[PDB]
Design a binder for this molecule. Structure first.
Ligand SMILES: [Zn+2]
Ligand SMILES: [Zn+2]
Lengths: 130, 174, 127, 173, 68
């Protein structure tokens, strides 16, 4: 059922956005740095208040300054994340009764003796990107 | 020198004092009851208060104090001022704090005569306290009304069953 | 839990299109399998999620998402900003609560002056 | 000869207390402590009668009988051998300690197990210094539960002085 | 370039050391912060009163008493 696949896709995209957003949260520099450079390549780009940039804050809380190696690292990580996202968005674009309900619900009875705890779909993903 | 304040005698059995210490004993002379010092003139008193030993005694008194000290329910609708007197006080001093309710046992009263029942006291900074007698041992005492969310505010009672229409100044309690 | 998951997600798939096939299934079969249909069963809540999600997939069917890198970044920044804001609201709340605790703890509950003797959730809103 | 009194109204005066308790028995003195800071009493008192019998009888009669300003008044009445032991086995329960040391001496209290350094040690309370001398004589540097244990006197430098033997001998006698 | 160029031997060496350390260092130290956001005695008394003067009593465990 394509519905399930497209669902899982939108969900994963959500997960990634949330990850790189958490990152941009802990150390605003990640975005700021980037954005500043972008400013001088695409002149239109709107950039945050200077005060925010300096105090390394996004709203009220000023975050601890990080060293260069880490900023760059996380930027490349976010890079691959955005790659994944672009891929999923792509496949998704390329992908997007009662008797059948009971029909499938019947086959769901298959292998009743499957003693196993299953807590690994959103946790393995959430975890896969944190 | 005294700034025109009347310093009462020690024996006069207590108009709020400026410094609630310096007295005049049965004799004429001036005293500081903390430091147990006798002062001849008010200038010497002002030097005592500006002295170091009196500060030490004030702190030691500070520490000395700080170490010791399907059913039926009721609903109340309390109304408050209509911007009549609250126009002179708006300095965000607990102004954001809503009225508060507490259940008090009559076992303790200013007169201590009769007792044996509870009161649903309701209080707000300027206005005077209010009470409501509750003979019934228990009414409307519910069981997990909401789904256990933890913002204690003041207590389970207040969050559980109170509403503060601050825009109209109406406090509902049930 | 694969069974439960699968039945929740399936009944959620069908429930997302008609909502009539399940209400008929319940009366036709009579199985303690779909006991999550009632808001009583905890899992029901997660159900309400899945369906919504599927309901969402039905939203832009026939429409592609053309978000660019720049945009995705901007978005994640704005989300961050939001989170920060929410965090601030939480903080403020905690503060006010603190004030309340202080004052409640600091008023005379012995200054009595009584007079007589003896649903709010939908009321604590606005309309 | 003195009895404790509690749950007293700070408004109560020594006059009222005396008038109350003289009904029960002759009262030699009443020490009713006041805070000299606030000139406010603390809500308790000590009432000293002449003999013990009057005190006991007053305790029996006046407890929870009378309410003063609704407040129900309360009336109430009012050095041994020690051994440090080191390198104990973790399999030794305090009760097993009891069974070990009972044959050597009668325990006034129970042993105390505490860990130093990991290192299981204990304090053992005997009613006698000589029984403890037996416990040390037999048990010192001895293997129990496949572990060598050391038995000596606990520090206060430790117990077992001459004055200690004398005054412990007297407390026993 | 100009800096390194105007260095001495020891200086240039220590600087190189620094660049090296920066190069081969963990991107996250075991000693970093998480959630540290900012916003926007009577000495003379005992000698007078007699205390803190060692004294001994034989009858109770040969006990010591710090004041008379
Ligand atoms: Zn003074
Ligand atoms: Zn002594």
């Amino acid at each position: 059922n394509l519905l399930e696949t497209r669902r899982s896709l939108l969900e994963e995209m959500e997960i990634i956005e949330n990850a790189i957003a958490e990152r941009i949260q802990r150390n605003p520099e990640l975005y700021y740095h980037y954005i500043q450079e972008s400013s001088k390549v695409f002149p239109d780009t709107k950039l945050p208040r200077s005060s925010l940039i300096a105090e390394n804050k996004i709203y009220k809380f000023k975050k601890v300054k990080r060293k260069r190696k880490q900023i760059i690292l996380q930027q490349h990580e976010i890079n691959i994340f955005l790659r994944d996202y672009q891929e999923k968005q792509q496949t998704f674009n390329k992908i997007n009764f009662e008797r059948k309900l009971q029909q499938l619900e019947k086959e769901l009875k298959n292998e009743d003796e499957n003693f196993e705890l299953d807590i690994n779909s959103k946790k393995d993903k959430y975890a896969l990107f944190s | 020198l005294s700034k025109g304040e009347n310093v009462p005698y020690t024996f006069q059995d207590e108009q709020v004092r400026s410094n609630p210490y310096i007295y005049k004993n049965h004799s004429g002379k001036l005293v500081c009851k903390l430091c147990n010092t006798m002062h001849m003139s008010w200038s010497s008193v002002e030097r005592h208060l500006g002295g170091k030993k009196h500060g030490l005694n004030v702190l030691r008194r500070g520490i000395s104090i700080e170490k010791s000290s399907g059913s039926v329910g009721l609903a109340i609708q309390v109304n408050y001022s209509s911007e009549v007197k609250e126009n002179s006080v708006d300095s965000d001093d607990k102004a954001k704090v809503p009225p508060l309710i507490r259940i008090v046992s009559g076992l303790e009263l200013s007169d201590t005569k009769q007792k044996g029942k509870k009161f649903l006291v309701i209080a707000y900074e300027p206005f005077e306290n209010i009470a409501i007698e509750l003979p019934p041992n228990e009414i409307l005492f519910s069981e997990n009304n909401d789904m256990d969310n933890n913002n204690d505010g003041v207590d389970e009672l207040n969050k559980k069953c109170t509403f503060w229409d601050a825009i109209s100044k109406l406090y509902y309690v049930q | 839990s694969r069974r439960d998951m699968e039945v929740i997600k399936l009944t959620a798939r069908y429930y997302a299109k008609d909502k009539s096939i399940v209400e008929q299934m319940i009366s036709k079969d009579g199985e303690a399998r779909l006991n999550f249909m009632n808001s009583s069963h905890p899992l029901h809540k997660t159900f309400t999620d899945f369906v919504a999600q599927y309901k969402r997939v039905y939203s832009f069917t026939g429409q592609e998402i053309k978000k660019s890198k720049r945009t995705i970044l901007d978005n994640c920044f704005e989300r961050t900003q939001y989170w920060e804001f929410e965090k601030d609201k939480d903080r403020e709340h905690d503060k006010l609560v603190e004030l309340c605790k202080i004052q409640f703890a600091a008023i005379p509950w012995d200054k009595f002056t009584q007079v007589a003797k003896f649903d709010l959730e939908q009321m604590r809103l606005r309309r | 000869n003195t009895v404790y009194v509690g749950n007293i109204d700070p408004r109560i005066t020594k006059e009222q207390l005396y008038e109350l308790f003289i009904q029960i028995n002759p009262v030699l003195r009443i020490k009713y402590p006041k805070d000299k800071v606030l000139q406010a009493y603390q809500g308790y008192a000590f009432i000293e009668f002449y003999n013990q019998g009057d005190a006991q009888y007053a305790i029996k009669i006046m407890n929870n009988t009378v309410r003063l300003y609704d407040r129900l008044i309360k009336v109430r009445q009012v050095p041994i051998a020690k051994l440090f032991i080191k390198n104990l086995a973790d399999s030794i329960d305090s009760d097993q300690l009891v069974k070990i040391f009972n044959k050597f001496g009668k325990l006034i209290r129970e042993p105390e197990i505490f860990y130093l350094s990991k290192l299981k040690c204990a304090y053992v309370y005997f009613e006698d210094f000589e029984k403890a001398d037996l416990a040390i004589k037999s048990l010192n540097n001895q293997l129990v539960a496949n572990n060598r244990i050391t038995v000596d006197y606990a520090f206060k430098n430790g117990k077992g002085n001459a004055k200690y033997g004398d005054d412990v001998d007297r407390l026993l006698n | 370039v100009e800096r390194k160029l105007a260095f001495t031997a020891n200086e240039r060496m220590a600087e190189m050391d620094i660049l090296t350390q920066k190069y081969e260092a963990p991107a996250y130290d075991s000693t970093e912060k998480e959630g540290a956001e900012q916003v926007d005695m009577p000495y003379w008394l005992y000698k007078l009163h007699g205390l803190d003067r060692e004294y001994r009593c034989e009858i109770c465990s040969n006990k010591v008493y710090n004041g008379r």
